[PDB]
Design a binder for this molecule. Structure first.
Ligand SMILES: *[C@](O)(C(=O)NCCCCCC)[C@H](C[C@@H]1CCNC1=O)NC(=O)[C@@H]1[C@@H]2[C@H](CN1C(=O)[C@@H](NC(=O)NC(C)(C)C)C(C)(C)C)C2(C)C
Ligand SMILES: *[C@](O)(C(=O)NCCCCCC)[C@H](C[C@@H]1CCNC1=O)NC(=O)[C@@H]1[C@@H]2[C@H](CN1C(=O)[C@@H](NC(=O)NC(C)(C)C)C(C)(C)C)C2(C)C
Lengths: 306, 306
């Protein structure tokens, strides 16, 4: 037993990280087959930086302007193209460590592992959620651009995030691996703010089920609630609406614990209305919302990756 | 910015995990050069299990009794020996993925990454501390024995933990990689209890410094305290004594933030005495004690591994 914020094993992604240097800018790239993916603002400088036109900026570049450093081995760029806000550098060598992979654009509320990197070298791995306001609460210092987020599904790495920038509230914004920002953000220094966030209700419920699976039983009650009456309480506390689809997804966990989803909603209602009164759940004094129903099942049943 | 429970990149350890099967028991082993390390209770059965004599049990074993499965490749055991509570299986093949490594026995309060594994396949990675009572609050299901904990220091993996068992409170006990249990535990089903735990004071202080580095400034105060007067308050709240050595270790963080260590102690004092009053620090409503001073510096300055 026990329940931890668990990341996927990072080895499959570690073997893909490279350093991309252009001009005075150095950041991380992702090397899959013979392509290196990195944020397009690597072609920017200290003054391009306020309102650049990346199409103009890129037409002015030559392949030899791109230093791609794969460990102590230099990779030669033989072509480049821009796809939305990512740059794709064609190199003459296919990454022999390329895992089976997919690029996926995730929905808010879904979680993923982030491999934080500097100068092409991994620093650490941690678990994140895509917040409802399309930011992530990451841990990113200067130089971390191009670090990626990912899930692993049996043997396949599903890349879902590449880091671009930090918002003045200390949260982070980035793109999918096809260069489309999550949320309304743009890779331009103009005023941008995250937008009001909300708590991921279906994930809180999953985590309460995790608690029950692990022996925290104390927040349960005899009551039930309707979805409607629950959602009226959730809105007051800035929680995302719970949909019948969320209820269906929580089915397996409800069946394993014997606690109907709507009964667990009645428990969440009382926790919102009464607080936790100096008690903890799974070692937290807050209601945790960065575990999906799938995360809970994976960790409570022991799914591996090969 | 941002601050997360960060694990080390796990790839160097993923390449060392194997499956060890003997009799009806299957667990994980660690393959370094031509040796596989695993818990000695792999030689146990459903009834050996209450009071085994592992020396007798092992003399009765043959090399061919040990199935070591490295992916879809079987490793032949050519020798075996017991070292305390770990079994060392000599195999005919050296692991080509063997990283630079050391075996280290850590002190309580020190943190490490755990690569949770089942059937030789990694499931997830998370960060732990060795509690003052020599347990760890892990996430371990049946089959996880032989998963290891580790730190990485530039290019060197320092293995510090191998998982053996779960205590009735849902916490975990194990050994160093030389098979010596942390704490008073034994690999025998007899009554054993963790012992009263305490909070790791020097780590809480490190995490408050992390908060200041990241812009949470609110818990600070104008006051100071003596070490003596601080430790009198810490004892009341079941905190470990803070030593002058801890104060010295916190020096760099104190110098970077401009907050004297004893001034941060005065802040911790008021947090213990007053609670947090519905506020959070670094996204937690509890005082966090599983970041060491080194963890904070590493994450707030961006140290990598190559
Ligand atoms: C990222 O570019 C990086 O790691 N680069 C390494 C090389 C030095 C700079 C190259 C451009 C970096 C990651 C940031 C740094 C701190 N935390 C992070 O996550 N991204 C950026 O530097 C992006 C980049 C340029 C600015 N920027 C920022 O993140 C800005 N933030 C904003 O300007 N935000 C608003 C636009 C919303 C106001 C800071 C101030 C944090 C540097 C672009 C946005 C093109
Ligand atoms: C570990 O052996 C394992 O993963 N093995 C896989 C093969 C099946 C059993 C082989 C022995 C397993 C990990 C445990 C399981 C649940 N959580 C874990 O961390 N360890 C054990 O099964 C150890 C092993 C035998 C019992 N045991 C336990 O952990 C016991 N706990 C205790 O008996 N604890 C006291 C001795 C303190 C009472 C449980 C009940 C959790 C199975 C030994 C201790 C030799």
């Amino acid at each position: 037993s026990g329940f931890r914020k668990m990341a996927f094993p990072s080895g499959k992604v570690e073997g893909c990280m490279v350093q991309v240097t252009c001009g005075t800018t150095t950041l991380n790239g992702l090397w899959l087959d013979d392509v290196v993916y990195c944020p397009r603002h690597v072609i920017c400088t200290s003054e391009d930086m306020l309102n650049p036109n990346y199409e103009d900026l890129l037409i002015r570049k030559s392949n030899h302007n791109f230093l791609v450093q794969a460990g102590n081995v230099q990779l030669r760029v033989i072509g480049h193209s821009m796809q939305n806000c990512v740059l794709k550098l064609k190199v003459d060598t296919a990454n022999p460590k390329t895992p089976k992979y997919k690029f996926v654009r995730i929905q808010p509320g879904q979680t993923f592992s982030v491999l934080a990197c500097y100068n092409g070298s991994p620093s650490g791995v941690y678990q994140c959620a895509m917040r409802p306001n399309f930011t992530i609460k990451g841990s990113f210092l200067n130089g971390s651009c191009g670090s990626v987020g990912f899930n692993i599904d049996y043997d396949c790495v599903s890349f879902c995030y590449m880091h671009h920038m930090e918002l003045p509230t200390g949260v982070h914004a980035g793109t999918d691996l096809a260069g489309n920002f999550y949320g309304p953000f743009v890779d331009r220094q103009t005023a941008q703010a995250a937008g009001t966030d909300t708590t991921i209700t279906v994930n809180v419920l999953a985590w309460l089920y995790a608690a029950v699976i692990n022996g925290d039983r104390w927040f349960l009650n005899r009551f039930t609630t309707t979805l409607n009456d629950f959602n009226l309480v959730a809105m007051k506390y800035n929680y995302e609406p719970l949909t019948q689809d969320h209820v269906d997804i929580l089915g397996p966990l409800s069946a394993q614990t014997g606690i109907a989803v709507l009964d667990m909603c009645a428990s969440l209602k009382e926790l919102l209305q009464n607080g936790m009164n100096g008690r903890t759940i799974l070692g937290s004094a807050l209601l945790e919302d960065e575990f999906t129903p799938f995360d809970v099942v994976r960790q409570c049943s022991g799914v591996t990756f090969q």
